[PDB]
Symmetry: C7
Subunit: 159 residues, 7 copies
């Protein structure tokens, strides 16, 4: 057992380092395998992502929403734009984050269309309207997890 494999036995899936197509392949593979291992038990996902490809991160967001396990997401260190989506996509009520975490939401025409999809999915999961998020995506700033608990991304900031 590699420690990553030992962790996977306890249904802990890491996402750390920039989300590329290869990390997505491993994360999707583990998730599908963890679903077939159990259609009931939770899965824990640890997010430390400085960034990610939009179509890669969208594939993981799809897979998480279209899987029947409860997904608990933990912010360790930083969840940049693509990671903040994946954090906010964990099952509502079970999105934890560590005290000194850093969250950032901010990121031709097809890119605007996909960016429009991101606006819509962020509005659903954080339960803000479209216009609130339209401004909050525009501001290129990190935020502390206490502000993110109020903004609606996190549920409980864990110390």
């Amino acid at each position: 057992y590699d420690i990553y494999s030992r962790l996977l036995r306890e249904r802990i899936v890491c996402v750390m380092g920039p989300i590329d197509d290869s990390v997505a392949s491993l994360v999707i593979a583990q998730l599908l395998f963890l679903q077939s291992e159990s259609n009931k038990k939770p899965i824990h996902m640890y997010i430390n992502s400085p960034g990610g490809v939009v179509t890669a991160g969208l594939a993981i967001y799809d897979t998480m929403q279209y899987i029947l396990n409860p997904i608990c997401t933990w912010c360790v260190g930083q969840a940049a734009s693509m990671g903040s989506l994946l954090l906010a996509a964990g099952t509502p009520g079970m999105r934890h984050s560590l005290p000194n975490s850093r969250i950032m939401i901010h990121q031709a025409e097809e890119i605007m269309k996909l960016k429009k999809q991101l606006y819509n999915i962020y509005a659903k999961h954080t339960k803000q309207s479209l216009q609130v998020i339209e401004s909050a995506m525009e501001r290129d700033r990190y935020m502390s997890p206490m502000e993110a608990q109020e903004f609606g991304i996190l549920d409980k900031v864990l110390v």
Copy 2:
């Protein structure tokens, strides 16, 4: 890369009859996927295979190689789209057992891609028509247009069979 107990994670999923086609379609990916399928079809003549696509494109002859073997295998084939199925990916996506080319709601799909390339394009046209039922000039118009499509819109063109907003 994770291990599971000693199978690699992919080696475990291959037991669940799942073929991961990700990344560019190249000779190695085709060689590996063709070989995977030959094995899986030797384990059963009837059990549906699941092929999961996230691919930006690839070599035209490589995608045709997987397409050919997909036709020759007797098993049913679920073809799922996670992320994107561009260029040759859309042919592999279209090539599943008609009626069960499933997909995931936020995917993005793109059919768009001397005389060898021209004659070869007239082959892609015919095979898209057989799976998507469309007419040849319609395909040539759509293929000529370079813009992503949605899984709702993809199902209206016929490439996808069912978007799943969740497991049913």
Copy 3:
């Protein structure tokens, strides 16, 4: 990389399925000939399947594979997958007459000091021995650089049968 427990190619090798995929170089020539001589060691009458997907290759490595294929008594079924270009077509042609197959969309193509023109006569000669067409016929085919469909490969004798679904 490769699905392992005893990767898939060792697993395919066990059923006498010998891949030649990617270009034919001396490195792959060394491996392919070794597999053949092993498979002849375990059983001599039984079939061997060779799957060819090659864009081309170094002429002297393919020739090494070619006369190795001739040397063994096994019937060698060749399967053309995506490409049999240049030497791949010659390796495809080397199968036991009747058993050189293609998938319905593969592209087959035979176009390629003093030794190179002498090497080409050998290529002329060896294509002719396997395709039964005349010598000037083969010199006319390879002078023009074009890919040709599997239906045409049947009439030229390179294939014997294109298989959409098994009989």
Copy 4:
């Protein structure tokens, strides 16, 4: 692996520059060892020229999350985030061998980022904010004996 045989005896070797890759290994060993037991401590060997700021924080809050006592041994150089991790050891159990060197030194999020480091240093070293603010600004490696009066180490060890 001599490294994996040191994991059986509850030793985590944070050596080399701190990066997200080093962070993934380190936090994973820590979470595993807590699952093994909640009583026996974790021995942490720090030797790091430098570190990604958010990586070192990810170790620290993982450090402070676990119920284990964490024995922190500096060997060689514990610098920048390595000094946060060196301070991050449980109070009463921060060690060094006598030849080591230590350095605390290191867009509004950068300002808030540097600010949150001040608070954590103040919590564990118990020095006031102005003391730590000036000290981090001083680009100077400190000797362990200076670090010990500054409070970062409980014990400097000569021939234990």
Copy 5:
């Protein structure tokens, strides 16, 4: 990568060593010389009389590495069975001729060539003498023929004395 056929599982090359087959394939190097020399020493320890088959496909290589292989080939008391496949050019031709007489072989379709710091001369003068010993040709025929740059058919090499049989089937 190499197909791992199971038996403990051997590489396909390790399987062929069991059958006493040494694959000298690719450009001859100091590393290939070490690999090939070690295999030959192990094979004599394996059997003091049973033959050793050497498959040669070498575009050439460093002469001082080729000679190191050839020297052990001469030293080893077992019969050696040198098969040309593909090509045996420059130093690979010397090993092709280094097998026991009447047992050096060539596939019907191989291409063979004997054409290749003043040691370059004294060593080249060495190569002529070893070619003279093994091909049974005189020194002058070798001197003039080695300067000709041209691959030779297996029939021409047969009549030169390098190889003893070109066949189509094992019989």
Copy 6:
């Protein structure tokens, strides 16, 4: 593996540069061998052109904390930090082969670190600090016989 076969026999090979990477392994191997036996000798073989000072200092620190007698064998050259390791063998069992090549030669912070090097040589070579000053200034490798009179070695052996 051959190197781990030597570890079974209590041999630790500092072969090549003393870099952060190799210091981590040698420290780890040393801690292991202290646990295997609390009394049996530990043998060290040195062939080092040099390395980074802070990593060599981490090796020296551990060698001093390990209780056991450390036999330092010079095999090849011991340049810069390797000679400090060689001089840090427990007195009475610092050895070298006849044809070995030995070399002690090497901002404010480098000065401070280099002032540390002086004393650690001084207390092990039994030389006055001004003497270490002059003999650490000259860029010249010295024979094992010359090193014995300076104070680095104890025996220059030709056969055991």
Copy 7:
């Protein structure tokens, strides 16, 4: 392939020193040498040399280990032995330094270079029985010596013409 047949060759006490002598090769060679002495203090060791020389301070580390050991060392030059590699060839036990019929041998390779040059001369002089004057003159010359020239020089004892 490379490193398990050599593990087999370690079994019958053959140490392959091939490729340029670098400290990694030198450190592995001495590690094998001490290990083989640890197996038996009296049995022979076979050394196979094909090296286009290498780094002098590590070749002296190899050379010093060879004079250290109790087991007799037999050096078999194959191919070419150059520079520092020729020092290993000379340093086998007198009476056990051999070569193939057509190997090639060469003895040619700050104050440290000058001092290193002097001590190499003593080693060659001790094991080859020449005068230091002969070694100076013979070490300047760049030429490779034939095996028969090397036997008469005294570097080697016997050539395996048989």
